Amino acid sequence: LVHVASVEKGRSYEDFQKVYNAIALKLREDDEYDNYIGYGPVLVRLAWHISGTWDKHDNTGGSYGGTYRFKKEFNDPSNAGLQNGFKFLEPIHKEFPWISSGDLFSLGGVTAVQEMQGPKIPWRCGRVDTPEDTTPDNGRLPDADKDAGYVRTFFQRLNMNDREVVALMGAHALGKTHLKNSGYEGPGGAANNVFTNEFYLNLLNEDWKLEKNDANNEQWDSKSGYMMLPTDYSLIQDPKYLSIVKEYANDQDKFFKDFSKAFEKLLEDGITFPKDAPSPFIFKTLEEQGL
Ligand code: HEM
Question: Where is heme b bound in this sequence?
Answer without folding.
Answer: 172
